[PDB]
Amino acid sequence: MIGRLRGIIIEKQPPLVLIEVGGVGYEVHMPMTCFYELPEAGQEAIVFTHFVVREDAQLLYGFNNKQERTLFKELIKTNGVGPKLALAILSGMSAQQFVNAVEREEVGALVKLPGIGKKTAERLIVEMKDRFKGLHGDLFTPTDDAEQEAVARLVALGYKPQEASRMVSKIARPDASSETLIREALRAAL
Amino acid sequence: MIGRLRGIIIEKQPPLVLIEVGGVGYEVHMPMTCFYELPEAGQEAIVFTHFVVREDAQLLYGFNNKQERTLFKELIKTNGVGPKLALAILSGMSAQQFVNAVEREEVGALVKLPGIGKKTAERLIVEMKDRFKGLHGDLFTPTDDAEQEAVARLVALGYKPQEASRMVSKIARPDASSETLIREALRAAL
Amino acid sequence: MIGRLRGIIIEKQPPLVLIEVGGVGYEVHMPMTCFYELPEAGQEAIVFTHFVVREDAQLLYGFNNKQERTLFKELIKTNGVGPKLALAILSGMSAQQFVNAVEREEVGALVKLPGIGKKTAERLIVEMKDRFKGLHGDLFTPTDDAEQEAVARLVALGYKPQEASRMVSKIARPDASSETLIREALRAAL
Amino acid sequence: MIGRLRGIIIEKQPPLVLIEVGGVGYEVHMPMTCFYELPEAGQEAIVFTHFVVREDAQLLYGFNNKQERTLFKELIKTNGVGPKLALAILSGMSAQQFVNAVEREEVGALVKLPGIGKKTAERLIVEMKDRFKGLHGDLFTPTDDAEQEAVARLVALGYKPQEASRMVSKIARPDASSETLIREALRAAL
C-alpha cells in the first residue's frame, strides 16, 4: 500500500533508518548503497518503499529512486532470491554495477556473497539478464517512453506482452498520452 | 479499514497513482476509465478505496465515486472474478457501459477481454444482471432513497432481504431518517 | 493497534460511518444504538475502536464510549458470537438494555434476533451473566476503582484472578495509585 | 514497520496506554517498569515500539528506550518466551535487574513469575546469558562503538558473526563511519 515516505531522519542504524512522519516513526530497511546517499539525521528525506508482509512482521524496504526499487522487486520475484538476500546483493554492489555484472555475466563477483548460490548465481544471471530486456530505464538501458508506458499498462491489464507490443505500435506516435495510447489501444481491441 | 483518500497526486503510472497524504505516499490501483478522470500531478485528488489483503501484499483499489466502487465490489464477490480482472473489465469499459452490456446481455463485448471466460462471460451476465436488482443508484437504475437505505442496513444486520423489505415498507413515509426508519423497524420486531 | 479515532464525519451509511483523519478516511462499523449518538456530517467526532483482522479484510468496529466497547469485546470472546452478530445485538438493543436482559435472564428478547440461537441465547445469558461479575463499571454495576484497576493489570500480567484479588486487598487503601498498588503488589510477590 | 511514536498521552490503563498521534489513538502495551516512567496524561510522550502480528490482532509493545526494546526482542526470540510473558518479566523487574539476575544466574527470582518455567527459568538464564555477549550497550555492558555497529550491520547482511568480526577488526580505527567501515569491509571482501 505504501510506495513512498517523506519525513525527517530521526536515527540511522545501518541498514535500518527511522523516518518520522507526522509523529509516526517508520523503520525502513535499506541496502547499504542507498544508505550511503541518505541525508543527515535531522533533515528531510524522501524514500521509495516496498512493503513486505511476513508471518510475524510487516516490513518496509526503501530506496533512493524508483529504478533501484524496480531492480529489487525484480530480484525478489525469482525463486532463489528473497528480500534479505536482495538487500545483501545491493549492499555489496550498486544497482549499476549489479546490472553490469549480469550483462557481462560475471558470476565470480556474485558468489563473493553470503547465501549466494553458484547454480544460484548462474541461474540468476541468466534470469535477470532476461528480465532486463522487458525493462526500460536508464538503469536497464546501458524506444518511445509513452509507448513503453502504454505497453506496461496494457500488460498490467492482462495482455500478453507481445500482444500489447503490437496493440500500441499499430496506432501511434507522439504528443500522445500513454494515457491516450492506452485508451486508443483498448477501443481498437474490444 | 481505508475507504477514502484525500491528498496530492505525486505521480501517475497507469494504472498506478501515488497520492501523498501528510507525507505518506499511498499507491492506488485504478481502472483506466477512472484514471482518465484524475487531476494533474501536483493537484489535490479525492479517491474512494477498496482494500485488498493478499498473501504477500496489501493493496488499495481506487475509484472516482462510490458507485464505481460498488460495482467493483460486486464483481469481485463472484467466483470467477478477482480484483485484477475486475480492474481489467473497468479499464476496457466504463461502469456505465459495463452495466449496459450486462443488462443488454452482450457477451460478445465481454469476451474481447483477456482472462475473460465465455461460460464465465455468460455466467457473469446472468449473475450481475441479478445483483443489480437489489442495487439502487443512478448506475444500477437506468423507490424511496431512505427506505432503500434502511433496508440495506437492516440487511447488513442479518435480516433476509425480503424480511427487511417488509419490515420498513409496514411503517413508513417521508421526512424520516433512514436512521429513524431503521430504528422503528427494529423496535417493532424485537 | 488503533483504539480511538478523532476526526470529521464525512458520510453516514448505517451502520457504516466514514471519519476523516488528516486526509485518511476510515470506515467504521457501528451498532445502530451508537450510531444514533453520532454528530452530523461535517462535525468532529470521537470514536473508540476495536480492530478486527479477517481473512480478506481489516475492519474497525466503533463505539461512543469504552463501556460499550468492552461489552462488545466480551460478547465476541464467546464461542457462539462473532463481530457481525455482536453488532446486530447492539443494534437491536442498547448496552444498558442488553445488560439488563442478561441479568434478568430474558431469552425471549434475545431470540427475536437473527442468527440468534436459543441454546445460544440461553448459553449466552449464562455466560455473560458470569463475565459481568469480574466486570466493573457503571454498565456492569447496576469497590475501590484503583484496586479493581490494579487487579485487572495484575491479571493482565498472568496472575489468576483470585491471586491478584488477594495480592492487592493484603496491602491497600487510598490515595494510592493503581500504579502504586500494582507496583507494591509485585515487590511483595517476587 | 512502526518503530517509534511521538504524541499526546490520552489515557493510562496499565499496562495499556493510549497515545494520540495526529488524531489516531494508538494502543500501546508496556511493561509496568516502563509504565512508571510515562508522563502525565495530556503531555507529550515518546515511545519505542515493537510490532506484533497475531492471528486475530496487530499489537504494539512500547518501551522508554531502545535498550529495553532490545532486551524484549531478545527474550521473545527464545522458544519458551512470548510477548505476553516478556511483558510480565519486565513488569516484575526492570531491564537492569533482569540483566543482573541472568548474569548472577538467580533462577529463584525468575520462578516467582507466573508461567515462568523452572527448566524454563534455567534454560532462559543460560540462553540469555549467552545472547548478551554479542549484545553491546550500557544495559548489556555492566570496545569501539562504530566497529561494533559495522559488525552488526555486516551480520544483518548475512555474514557469520566471526567473519564480520574479523572483516572490520583487519581494517580499522577511528574517525571512521561505521558507514565507512561497513563500506570498506565490503569492498575488501567482494
Side-chain angles (χ1 to χ4, degrees), chain C residues 137-140 142 146 150-152 154-159 161 164-165 167-169 171-172 174 176-182:
Chain C
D138 274 5
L139 235 210
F140 316 116
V151 184
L154 280 170
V155 169
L157 296 192
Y159 284 109
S165 303
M167 316 195 28
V168 33
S169 15
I171 299 175
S177 180
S178 48
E179 211 160 313
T180 290
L181 273 43
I182 298 208

mmCIF file of all heavy atoms in Angstrom, chain C residues 137-182, unseen atoms left out:
data_model
loop_
_atom_site.group_PDB
_atom_site.id
_atom_site.type_symbol
_atom_site.label_atom_id
_atom_site.label_comp_id
_atom_site.label_asym_id
_atom_site.label_seq_id
_atom_site.Cartn_x
_atom_site.Cartn_y
_atom_site.Cartn_z
ATOM 1 N N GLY C 137 -17.806 -1.358 36.324
ATOM 2 C CA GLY C 137 -18.143 -0.156 35.612
ATOM 3 C C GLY C 137 -19.626 0.078 35.661
ATOM 4 O O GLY C 137 -20.398 -0.867 35.760
ATOM 5 N N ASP C 138 -20.055 1.305 35.586
ATOM 6 C CA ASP C 138 -21.440 1.802 35.602
ATOM 7 C C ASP C 138 -22.366 0.823 34.879
ATOM 8 O O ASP C 138 -23.449 0.483 35.372
ATOM 9 C CB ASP C 138 -21.526 3.145 34.884
ATOM 10 C CG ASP C 138 -21.224 4.334 35.792
ATOM 11 O OD1 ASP C 138 -20.839 4.135 37.007
ATOM 12 O OD2 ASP C 138 -21.356 5.532 35.335
ATOM 13 N N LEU C 139 -21.905 0.409 33.717
ATOM 14 C CA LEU C 139 -22.633 -0.536 32.864
ATOM 15 C C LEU C 139 -22.839 -1.854 33.617
ATOM 16 O O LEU C 139 -23.978 -2.281 33.855
ATOM 17 C CB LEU C 139 -21.823 -0.818 31.590
ATOM 18 C CG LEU C 139 -22.597 -0.559 30.290
ATOM 19 C CD1 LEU C 139 -22.139 -1.456 29.139
ATOM 20 C CD2 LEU C 139 -24.101 -0.793 30.438
ATOM 21 N N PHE C 140 -21.704 -2.434 33.967
ATOM 22 C CA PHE C 140 -21.613 -3.739 34.645
ATOM 23 C C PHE C 140 -21.749 -3.597 36.159
ATOM 24 O O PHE C 140 -21.675 -4.596 36.894
ATOM 25 C CB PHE C 140 -20.263 -4.359 34.309
ATOM 26 C CG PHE C 140 -19.949 -4.189 32.831
ATOM 27 C CD1 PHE C 140 -18.858 -3.413 32.421
ATOM 28 C CD2 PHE C 140 -20.774 -4.803 31.887
ATOM 29 C CE1 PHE C 140 -18.594 -3.252 31.056
ATOM 30 C CE2 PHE C 140 -20.512 -4.640 30.523
ATOM 31 C CZ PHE C 140 -19.422 -3.865 30.107
ATOM 32 N N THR C 141 -22.233 -2.494 36.652
ATOM 33 C CA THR C 141 -22.545 -2.281 38.088
ATOM 34 C C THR C 141 -23.888 -1.558 38.322
ATOM 35 O O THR C 141 -23.928 -0.418 38.813
ATOM 36 C CB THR C 141 -21.406 -1.593 38.918
ATOM 37 N N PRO C 142 -24.982 -2.252 37.963
ATOM 38 C CA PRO C 142 -26.357 -1.761 38.099
ATOM 39 C C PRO C 142 -26.431 -0.399 38.808
ATOM 40 O O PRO C 142 -27.513 0.203 38.940
ATOM 41 C CB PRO C 142 -27.114 -2.832 38.918
ATOM 42 N N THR C 143 -16.098 -1.965 44.258
ATOM 43 C CA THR C 143 -15.473 -1.417 45.471
ATOM 44 C C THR C 143 -14.585 -0.240 45.078
ATOM 45 O O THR C 143 -15.105 0.717 44.554
ATOM 46 C CB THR C 143 -14.705 -2.509 46.201
ATOM 47 N N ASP C 144 -13.296 -0.362 45.364
ATOM 48 C CA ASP C 144 -12.266 0.659 45.058
ATOM 49 C C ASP C 144 -11.929 0.629 43.560
ATOM 50 O O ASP C 144 -11.623 -0.426 42.995
ATOM 51 C CB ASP C 144 -10.998 0.330 45.849
ATOM 52 N N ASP C 145 -11.988 1.794 42.933
ATOM 53 C CA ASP C 145 -11.718 1.919 41.487
ATOM 54 C C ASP C 145 -10.279 1.499 41.173
ATOM 55 O O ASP C 145 -10.032 0.706 40.248
ATOM 56 C CB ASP C 145 -11.928 3.361 41.026
ATOM 57 N N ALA C 146 -9.269 2.012 41.889
ATOM 58 C CA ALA C 146 -7.838 1.727 41.708
ATOM 59 C C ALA C 146 -7.428 0.313 42.072
ATOM 60 O O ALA C 146 -6.513 -0.263 41.470
ATOM 61 C CB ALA C 146 -6.975 2.730 42.459
ATOM 62 N N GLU C 147 -8.087 -0.238 43.069
ATOM 63 C CA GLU C 147 -7.769 -1.573 43.465
ATOM 64 C C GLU C 147 -8.207 -2.496 42.343
ATOM 65 O O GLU C 147 -7.477 -3.388 41.914
ATOM 66 C CB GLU C 147 -8.434 -1.927 44.800
ATOM 67 N N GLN C 148 -9.421 -2.240 41.862
ATOM 68 C CA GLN C 148 -10.011 -3.008 40.794
ATOM 69 C C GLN C 148 -9.197 -2.881 39.535
ATOM 70 O O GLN C 148 -9.199 -3.778 38.688
ATOM 71 C CB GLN C 148 -11.448 -2.583 40.569
ATOM 72 N N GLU C 149 -8.497 -1.737 39.434
ATOM 73 C CA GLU C 149 -7.632 -1.438 38.303
ATOM 74 C C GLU C 149 -6.319 -2.201 38.484
ATOM 75 O O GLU C 149 -5.807 -2.846 37.559
ATOM 76 C CB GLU C 149 -7.403 0.066 38.135
ATOM 77 N N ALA C 150 -5.825 -2.140 39.679
ATOM 78 C CA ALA C 150 -4.546 -2.798 39.975
ATOM 79 C C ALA C 150 -4.663 -4.304 39.728
ATOM 80 O O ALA C 150 -3.710 -4.956 39.284
ATOM 81 C CB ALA C 150 -4.164 -2.558 41.438
ATOM 82 N N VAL C 151 -5.841 -4.801 40.023
ATOM 83 C CA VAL C 151 -6.184 -6.222 39.891
ATOM 84 C C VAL C 151 -6.174 -6.659 38.420
ATOM 85 O O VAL C 151 -5.531 -7.655 38.045
ATOM 86 C CB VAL C 151 -7.583 -6.434 40.456
ATOM 87 C CG1 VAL C 151 -8.005 -7.899 40.460
ATOM 88 C CG2 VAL C 151 -7.725 -5.937 41.898
ATOM 89 N N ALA C 152 -6.901 -5.900 37.628
ATOM 90 C CA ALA C 152 -7.038 -6.153 36.189
ATOM 91 C C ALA C 152 -5.658 -6.231 35.538
ATOM 92 O O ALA C 152 -5.396 -7.108 34.702
ATOM 93 C CB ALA C 152 -7.838 -5.025 35.537
ATOM 94 N N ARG C 153 -4.840 -5.283 35.996
ATOM 95 C CA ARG C 153 -3.472 -5.186 35.469
ATOM 96 C C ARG C 153 -2.673 -6.424 35.866
ATOM 97 O O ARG C 153 -1.998 -7.051 35.038
ATOM 98 C CB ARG C 153 -2.778 -3.945 36.033
ATOM 99 N N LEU C 154 -2.769 -6.754 37.135
ATOM 100 C CA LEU C 154 -2.066 -7.910 37.682
ATOM 101 C C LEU C 154 -2.559 -9.179 37.004
ATOM 102 O O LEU C 154 -1.822 -10.160 36.869
ATOM 103 C CB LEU C 154 -2.288 -8.000 39.179
ATOM 104 C CG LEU C 154 -1.392 -7.038 39.949
ATOM 105 C CD1 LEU C 154 -1.767 -6.940 41.425
ATOM 106 C CD2 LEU C 154 0.085 -7.435 39.903
ATOM 107 N N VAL C 155 -3.802 -9.133 36.584
ATOM 108 C CA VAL C 155 -4.413 -10.266 35.893
ATOM 109 C C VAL C 155 -3.966 -10.281 34.434
ATOM 110 O O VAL C 155 -3.614 -11.336 33.890
ATOM 111 C CB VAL C 155 -5.930 -10.176 35.948
ATOM 112 C CG1 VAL C 155 -6.606 -11.187 35.019
ATOM 113 C CG2 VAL C 155 -6.484 -10.442 37.348
ATOM 114 N N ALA C 156 -3.757 -9.059 33.884
ATOM 115 C CA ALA C 156 -3.240 -8.921 32.530
ATOM 116 C C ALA C 156 -1.852 -9.504 32.495
ATOM 117 O O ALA C 156 -1.404 -10.006 31.472
ATOM 118 C CB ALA C 156 -3.167 -7.453 32.102
ATOM 119 N N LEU C 157 -1.176 -9.419 33.653
ATOM 120 C CA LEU C 157 0.195 -9.912 33.810
ATOM 121 C C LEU C 157 0.323 -11.428 33.756
ATOM 122 O O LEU C 157 1.334 -11.962 33.284
ATOM 123 C CB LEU C 157 0.904 -9.317 35.038
ATOM 124 C CG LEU C 157 1.070 -7.817 34.904
ATOM 125 C CD1 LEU C 157 2.020 -7.287 35.970
ATOM 126 C CD2 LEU C 157 1.592 -7.513 33.508
ATOM 127 N N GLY C 158 -0.708 -12.125 34.237
ATOM 128 C CA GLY C 158 -0.716 -13.585 34.228
ATOM 129 C C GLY C 158 -1.227 -14.208 35.515
ATOM 130 O O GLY C 158 -1.398 -15.438 35.637
ATOM 131 N N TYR C 159 -1.461 -13.357 36.483
ATOM 132 C CA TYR C 159 -1.940 -13.799 37.749
ATOM 133 C C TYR C 159 -3.369 -14.202 37.697
ATOM 134 O O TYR C 159 -4.183 -13.523 37.070
ATOM 135 C CB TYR C 159 -1.806 -12.707 38.771
ATOM 136 C CG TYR C 159 -0.404 -12.584 39.201
ATOM 137 C CD1 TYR C 159 0.369 -11.484 38.832
ATOM 138 C CD2 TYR C 159 0.162 -13.592 39.977
ATOM 139 C CE1 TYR C 159 1.694 -11.380 39.251
ATOM 140 C CE2 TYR C 159 1.485 -13.504 40.402
ATOM 141 C CZ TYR C 159 2.246 -12.396 40.035
ATOM 142 O OH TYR C 159 3.544 -12.308 40.449
ATOM 143 N N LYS C 160 -3.661 -15.316 38.379
ATOM 144 C CA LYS C 160 -5.012 -15.820 38.467
ATOM 145 C C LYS C 160 -5.807 -14.807 39.279
ATOM 146 O O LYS C 160 -5.400 -14.345 40.360
ATOM 147 C CB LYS C 160 -5.109 -17.237 39.066
ATOM 148 N N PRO C 161 -6.927 -14.453 38.715
ATOM 149 C CA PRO C 161 -7.837 -13.501 39.288
ATOM 150 C C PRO C 161 -7.853 -13.485 40.800
ATOM 151 O O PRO C 161 -7.637 -12.441 41.409
ATOM 152 C CB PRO C 161 -9.213 -13.827 38.709
ATOM 153 C CG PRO C 161 -8.988 -14.811 37.550
ATOM 154 C CD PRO C 161 -7.523 -15.217 37.585
ATOM 155 N N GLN C 162 -8.105 -14.643 41.411
ATOM 156 C CA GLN C 162 -8.146 -14.721 42.865
ATOM 157 C C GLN C 162 -6.820 -14.330 43.505
ATOM 158 O O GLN C 162 -6.794 -13.652 44.548
ATOM 159 C CB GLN C 162 -8.646 -16.073 43.363
ATOM 160 N N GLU C 163 -5.715 -14.762 42.870
ATOM 161 C CA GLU C 163 -4.396 -14.441 43.383
ATOM 162 C C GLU C 163 -4.234 -12.957 43.448
ATOM 163 O O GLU C 163 -3.923 -12.385 44.481
ATOM 164 C CB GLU C 163 -3.225 -15.009 42.553
ATOM 165 N N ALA C 164 -4.453 -12.343 42.308
ATOM 166 C CA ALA C 164 -4.351 -10.921 42.201
ATOM 167 C C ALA C 164 -5.206 -10.245 43.264
ATOM 168 O O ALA C 164 -4.708 -9.399 44.014
ATOM 169 C CB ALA C 164 -4.783 -10.486 40.811
ATOM 170 N N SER C 165 -6.514 -10.654 43.307
ATOM 171 C CA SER C 165 -7.514 -10.125 44.261
ATOM 172 C C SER C 165 -6.910 -10.044 45.620
ATOM 173 O O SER C 165 -6.960 -9.025 46.296
ATOM 174 C CB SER C 165 -8.795 -10.958 44.345
ATOM 175 O OG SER C 165 -9.398 -11.073 43.076
ATOM 176 N N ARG C 166 -6.274 -11.097 45.930
ATOM 177 C CA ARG C 166 -5.682 -11.225 47.267
ATOM 178 C C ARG C 166 -4.449 -10.323 47.395
ATOM 179 O O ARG C 166 -4.337 -9.526 48.338
ATOM 180 C CB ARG C 166 -5.260 -12.676 47.517
ATOM 181 N N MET C 167 -3.680 -10.324 46.341
ATOM 182 C CA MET C 167 -2.366 -9.667 46.344
ATOM 183 C C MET C 167 -2.509 -8.164 46.657
ATOM 184 O O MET C 167 -1.666 -7.569 47.340
ATOM 185 C CB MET C 167 -1.684 -9.834 44.980
ATOM 186 C CG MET C 167 -1.794 -11.256 44.417
ATOM 187 S SD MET C 167 -0.673 -11.564 43.066
ATOM 188 C CE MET C 167 0.765 -10.525 43.218
ATOM 189 N N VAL C 168 -3.683 -7.526 46.200
ATOM 190 C CA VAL C 168 -3.788 -6.072 46.394
ATOM 191 C C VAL C 168 -4.584 -5.766 47.663
ATOM 192 O O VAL C 168 -4.257 -4.835 48.413
ATOM 193 C CB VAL C 168 -4.508 -5.435 45.204
ATOM 194 C CG1 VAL C 168 -5.580 -6.341 44.596
ATOM 195 C CG2 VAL C 168 -5.225 -4.133 45.569
ATOM 196 N N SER C 169 -5.609 -6.571 47.858
ATOM 197 C CA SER C 169 -6.519 -6.449 49.005
ATOM 198 C C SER C 169 -5.732 -6.432 50.315
ATOM 199 O O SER C 169 -6.033 -5.654 51.232
ATOM 200 C CB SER C 169 -7.481 -7.638 49.039
ATOM 201 O OG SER C 169 -7.015 -8.667 48.177
ATOM 202 N N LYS C 170 -4.319 -7.296 50.540
ATOM 203 C CA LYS C 170 -3.367 -7.506 51.641
ATOM 204 C C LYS C 170 -2.723 -6.172 52.028
ATOM 205 O O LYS C 170 -2.582 -5.852 53.216
ATOM 206 C CB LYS C 170 -2.280 -8.489 51.208
ATOM 207 N N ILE C 171 -2.350 -5.458 50.989
ATOM 208 C CA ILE C 171 -1.763 -4.114 51.081
ATOM 209 C C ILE C 171 -2.711 -3.172 50.344
ATOM 210 O O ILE C 171 -3.041 -3.381 49.172
ATOM 211 C CB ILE C 171 -0.379 -4.119 50.410
ATOM 212 C CG1 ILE C 171 0.607 -5.089 51.066
ATOM 213 C CG2 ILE C 171 0.307 -2.752 50.435
ATOM 214 C CD1 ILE C 171 1.946 -5.176 50.328
ATOM 215 N N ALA C 172 -3.159 -2.091 51.176
ATOM 216 C CA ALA C 172 -4.049 -1.242 50.375
ATOM 217 C C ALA C 172 -4.733 -0.183 51.238
ATOM 218 O O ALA C 172 -4.754 -0.288 52.481
ATOM 219 C CB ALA C 172 -5.183 -2.075 49.755
ATOM 220 N N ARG C 173 -5.189 0.746 50.461
ATOM 221 C CA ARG C 173 -6.078 1.821 50.822
ATOM 222 C C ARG C 173 -5.654 3.070 50.095
ATOM 223 O O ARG C 173 -4.666 3.102 49.369
ATOM 224 C CB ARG C 173 -6.528 1.678 52.245
ATOM 225 N N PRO C 174 -6.407 4.101 50.218
ATOM 226 C CA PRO C 174 -6.413 5.134 49.214
ATOM 227 C C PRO C 174 -5.310 6.105 49.299
ATOM 228 O O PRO C 174 -4.402 5.946 50.136
ATOM 229 C CB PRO C 174 -7.754 5.725 49.460
ATOM 230 C CG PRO C 174 -7.983 5.552 50.947
ATOM 231 C CD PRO C 174 -7.244 4.333 51.371
ATOM 232 N N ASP C 175 -5.482 6.777 48.075
ATOM 233 C CA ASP C 175 -4.538 7.861 47.806
ATOM 234 C C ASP C 175 -3.205 7.257 47.361
ATOM 235 O O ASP C 175 -2.141 7.869 47.504
ATOM 236 C CB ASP C 175 -4.365 8.698 49.073
ATOM 237 N N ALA C 176 -3.582 6.063 46.744
ATOM 238 C CA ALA C 176 -2.638 5.154 46.091
ATOM 239 C C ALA C 176 -2.793 5.294 44.575
ATOM 240 O O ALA C 176 -3.743 5.935 44.091
ATOM 241 C CB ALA C 176 -2.949 3.705 46.486
ATOM 242 N N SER C 177 -1.947 4.909 43.966
ATOM 243 C CA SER C 177 -2.009 4.878 42.502
ATOM 244 C C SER C 177 -2.003 3.430 42.042
ATOM 245 O O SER C 177 -1.030 2.688 42.243
ATOM 246 C CB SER C 177 -0.815 5.634 41.914
ATOM 247 O OG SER C 177 -0.869 5.614 40.495
ATOM 248 N N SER C 178 -3.286 3.093 41.527
ATOM 249 C CA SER C 178 -3.311 1.732 40.976
ATOM 250 C C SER C 178 -1.896 1.333 40.573
ATOM 251 O O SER C 178 -1.479 0.179 40.763
ATOM 252 C CB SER C 178 -4.237 1.685 39.758
ATOM 253 O OG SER C 178 -3.949 2.768 38.887
ATOM 254 N N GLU C 179 -1.208 2.325 40.042
ATOM 255 C CA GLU C 179 0.180 2.183 39.598
ATOM 256 C C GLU C 179 1.070 1.848 40.792
ATOM 257 O O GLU C 179 1.919 0.950 40.722
ATOM 258 C CB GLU C 179 0.666 3.486 38.966
ATOM 259 C CG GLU C 179 1.702 3.260 37.866
ATOM 260 C CD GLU C 179 1.828 4.448 36.918
ATOM 261 O OE1 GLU C 179 0.765 4.997 36.437
ATOM 262 O OE2 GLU C 179 2.994 4.899 36.604
ATOM 263 N N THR C 180 0.718 2.527 41.906
ATOM 264 C CA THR C 180 1.424 2.302 43.148
ATOM 265 C C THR C 180 1.097 0.924 43.727
ATOM 266 O O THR C 180 1.981 0.147 44.142
ATOM 267 C CB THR C 180 1.224 3.458 44.131
ATOM 268 O OG1 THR C 180 1.913 4.604 43.634
ATOM 269 C CG2 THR C 180 1.783 3.062 45.490
ATOM 270 N N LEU C 181 -0.191 0.631 43.714
ATOM 271 C CA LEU C 181 -0.701 -0.635 44.187
ATOM 272 C C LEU C 181 -0.013 -1.764 43.450
ATOM 273 O O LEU C 181 0.585 -2.656 44.068
ATOM 274 C CB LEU C 181 -2.221 -0.743 43.947
ATOM 275 C CG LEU C 181 -3.044 -0.148 45.080
ATOM 276 C CD1 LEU C 181 -2.425 1.168 45.519
ATOM 277 C CD2 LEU C 181 -4.477 0.079 44.615
ATOM 278 N N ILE C 182 -0.118 -1.703 42.097
ATOM 279 C CA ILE C 182 0.477 -2.691 41.191
ATOM 280 C C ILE C 182 1.941 -2.882 41.489
ATOM 281 O O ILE C 182 2.468 -3.988 41.564
ATOM 282 C CB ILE C 182 0.300 -2.287 39.748
ATOM 283 C CG1 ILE C 182 -1.176 -2.227 39.423
ATOM 284 C CG2 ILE C 182 0.957 -3.321 38.855
ATOM 285 C CD1 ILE C 182 -1.476 -2.494 37.948
#
